[PDB]
Amino acid sequence: KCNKVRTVTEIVNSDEKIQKTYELAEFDLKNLSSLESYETLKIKLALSKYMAMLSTLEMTQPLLEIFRNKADTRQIAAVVFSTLAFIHNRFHPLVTNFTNKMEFVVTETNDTSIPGEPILFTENEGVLLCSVDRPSIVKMLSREFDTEALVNFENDNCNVRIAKTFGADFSITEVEATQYLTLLLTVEHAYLHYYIFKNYGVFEYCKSLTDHSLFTNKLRSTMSTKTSNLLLSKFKFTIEDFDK
């Protein structure tokens, strides 16, 4: 489907004709470029907005310091609350509040720790309650988990890739800001199960926590193009190594 679009013209009275032909390969290219640049800009904007909102909240000390402390009862809960509200708005831009009952619990002990889902919920033991493993959460903030950028990519049809080579007080570090994306995505994941149980019963919620798999059924007629934070979808490891 190379589709050398083909064209002709003539003067009235058909004196004589002229012909030309042309190639979409530049046009589609440019469109893809513009599209991805645009959407990246949008996502960066969104993240900026979130960060600013957080900034509003009168923090006395840096985020990492907050989490490294454990005597607090306000700050961490408030942060969680704010993040949850933000996500709920990103799904329901006209909706603003959850009608009370939201309550949180600090957890401190390996002998209370739970694999995978670091943040957990009981939607109604009379009323909602939630629980958080601050100890574990802290651990991700080891900066050596972060380092300057590799630039790999694969499967390039030559200039399809190279073309881009011809296409043109909290004043604080990029990597520090990058820390946030962790809790962003974590809370996103958690909100998945939260929404599921909010819509349905407890036993399917348990099944989802056994496998975050059956979601692929129920999460339909649910995301009416309200895109979420999975742009670069090539999440994968080696697989054949599973060795049963």
Binding site: M53, F81, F98, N100, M102, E103, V106, L129
Partner: peptide, 14 residues
């Protein structure tokens, strides 16, 4: 719960 963390409802923005 270590704290009774909800009363009413609000949102922050700037």
């Amino acid at each position: 719960p270590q704290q009774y963390i909800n009363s009413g409802t609000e949102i922050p923005f700037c």
